[PDB]
Design an enzyme around this catalytic site. Structure first.
Site, PDB file in Angstrom:
ATOM      1  N   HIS A  47       0.855  -1.219   0.000  1.00 17.83           N
ATOM      2  CA  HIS A  47       0.000   0.000   0.000  1.00 17.83           C
ATOM      3  C   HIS A  47       0.881   1.256   0.000  1.00 17.83           C
ATOM      4  CE1 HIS A  47       0.355   1.152   4.194  1.00 17.83           C
ATOM      5  NE2 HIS A  47       0.043  -0.090   4.581  1.00 17.83           N
TER       6      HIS A  47
ATOM      7  N   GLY B  86       3.186   6.440   9.510  1.00 17.67           N
ATOM      8  CA  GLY B  86       4.582   6.387   9.070  1.00 17.67           C
ATOM      9  C   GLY B  86       5.251   5.123   9.580  1.00 17.67           C
TER      10      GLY B  86
ATOM     11  N   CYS C  69       4.146   1.964   9.305  1.00 18.07           N
ATOM     12  CA  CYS C  69       3.975   0.809   8.409  1.00 18.07           C
ATOM     13  C   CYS C  69       5.342   0.355   7.877  1.00 18.07           C
ATOM     14  CB  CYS C  69       2.943   1.092   7.326  1.00 18.07           C
ATOM     15  SG  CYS C  69       1.307   1.383   8.040  1.00 18.07           S
TER      16      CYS C  69
END
Ligand SMILES: CS(=O)(=O)NCCc1ccccc1
Ligand SMILES: CS(=O)(=O)NCCc1ccccc1
Ligand SMILES: [Cl-]
Ligand SMILES: [Cl-]
Lengths: 304, 304
Positions: free
Chosen positions: A41, A143, A145
């Site tokens: 993503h 941030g 991820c």
């Protein structure tokens, strides 16, 4: 003496963290040999996240669109592929700090360390368990991820988790390093409820063993029980069923303390049915379930 | 979202750990530039530990008696000196992995990470507070002496603790890196009782702020209080007195949540006087006091 919620030393993993930017989205990637792993993503706008078709979004992305920064130095992307929910970005340079590593899909109840990262830079390390509902209870801001979960056996890092998602209830979901979600979760901004967060019975028992070893004795009772009798009480209290496989794994802790597993089960049963009455065990007022039997042996023996 | 007991990434410190052997005693040392720091009782036999005269014991020790091993490689000792309760072993090679560092003596209530080490090898990392009685509640087995406590500001490691001792009650005592014990403790096998382990009030308040931020709201009440009224309740419950300096430090958390510090004090007061009634706050059944206001801001903002 003393028993602490302890994470693996994080150095070996710190050496693997990079920043991945694709358009306006920045998150973390894991650089092992000449491959960077990150949540797919990374390619998405928050608008894409409503119903993202990832293969379709990825058609509009080339090697040069993925910006990989290790420290304050750019890596050249020479290839990309989607594996399940992760992107593998091939870079023209092996990570010189690649430790010995494995990718492992863990089971619910298994504990691991998380190196929380922002822009490829580590902010902290903490110890987690994969919950029986395949969520984790993390500490993850925007941030974070692509921050990873890992175990270490001497010098080999076993990577088990990559962070993808917060559910609307503020619990966390992610993948193994093959990009396969733990549990039913998908990487979409859609309705996703967790199931019952039951207590990891074998872990509570291990931690009661840790307590005894460390001198916390007050909860030890005069009773024993059977797996079937204990499990009736477990069910009522949203504890995972205890199996003979769990009993087997607790064998070394039983042997050290000369407390039979079923006796420790009977003491857990009384704690469930009578509560702590305002008392504490290893500085907790509730029964801790994020130590595995292996964690308790490791900490109480001092493996490095 | 989510709030975890989080340690600093330990890599920078892992790069500083060595094994120090003097005779039959092995423990850990900290290698910074061309100096190794270790507990002076490295020179002692368990028989020496009853009433050790360290200057007298050290007369029988030369540079070559201290065996310093970094990884599986020996360092040459070219000088030694006692500073308070630490030995500074000068070695002929600067640690190539020396991070930017400071030595800082912390105050009670201040939190830090510990890299637990055995034979110069890291086993784990956990977050601690200096207790108001100048003990810490650690996880330390035999061989863990010389394991250090630290904070990190971006790229500068502030070393605040070195592990020396377990008290007979299984709590931990040690020095700053100038070899000065926290609290009244001495490095001798003698009678040493800790004072009252009071609760770090400013830290509980910070963690209640962390709770609110993370969606735990149930404990918020309809009351406010004054520092004097709150402190009467604090005293009764073995909580540290709250000062206006503590109120000042909580200002940024107050501003974010629009909950005045004195209102949060009134909610803490009700929690002390009424208990949790079997409820939890950030997955704790007791009031956590090992997060500083700075810790809560750091974690909730994501500093790296
Ligand atoms: C691409 S982003 O900037 O908008 N962040 C994505 C976070 C997310 C991941 C999975 C499902 C829902 C949200
Ligand atoms: C030198 S040793 O092997 O016997 N260990 C010393 C541990 C200790 C430190 C300070 C006070 C009491 C004991
Ligand atoms: Cl993110
Ligand atoms: Cl030791």
């Amino acid at each position: 003496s003393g028993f602490r919620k302890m994470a693996f030393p994080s150095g070996k993993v710190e050496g693997c963290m990079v920043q991945v930017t694709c358009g306006t989205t920045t998150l973390n990637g894991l650089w092992l040999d000449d491959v960077v792993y990150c949540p797919r993503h990374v390619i998405c706008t928050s608008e894409d996240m409503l119903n993202p078709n990832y293969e379709d979004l990825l058609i509009r992305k080339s090697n040069h669109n993925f910006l990989v920064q290790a420290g304050n130095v750019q890596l050249r992307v020479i290839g990309h592929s989607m594996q399940n929910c992760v992107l593998k970005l091939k870079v023209d340079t092996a990570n010189p700090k690649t430790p010995k590593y494995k990718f492992v899909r863990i089971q619910p109840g298994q504990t691991f360390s998380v190196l929380a990262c922002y822009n490829g830079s580590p902010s902290g390390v903490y110890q987690c368990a994969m919950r029986p509902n395949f969520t984790i209870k993390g500490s993850f801001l925007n941030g974070s991820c692509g921050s990873v979960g890992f175990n270490i056996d001497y010098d080999c890092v076993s990577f088990c988790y990559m962070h993808h998602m917060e559910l609307p209830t503020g619990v966390h979901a992610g993948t193994d390093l093959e990009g396969n979600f733990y549990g039913p979760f998908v990487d979409r901004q859609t309705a996703q409820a967790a199931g019952t967060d039951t207590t990891i019975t074998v872990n509570v028992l291990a931690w009661l063993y840790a307590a005894v070893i460390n001198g916390d004795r007050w909860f030890l009772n005069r009773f024993t029980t059977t797996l079937n009798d204990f499990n009736l009480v477990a069910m009522k209290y949203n504890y995972e069923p205890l199996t003979q496989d769990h009993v087997d794994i607790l064998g070394p802790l039983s042997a050290q303390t000369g407390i039979a597993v079923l006796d420790m089960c009977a003491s857990l049963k009384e704690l469930l049915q009578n509560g702590m009455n305002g008392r504490t065990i290893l500085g907790s007022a509730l029964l801790e379930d994020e130590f595995t039997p292996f964690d308790v042996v490791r900490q109480c023996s001092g493996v490095t």
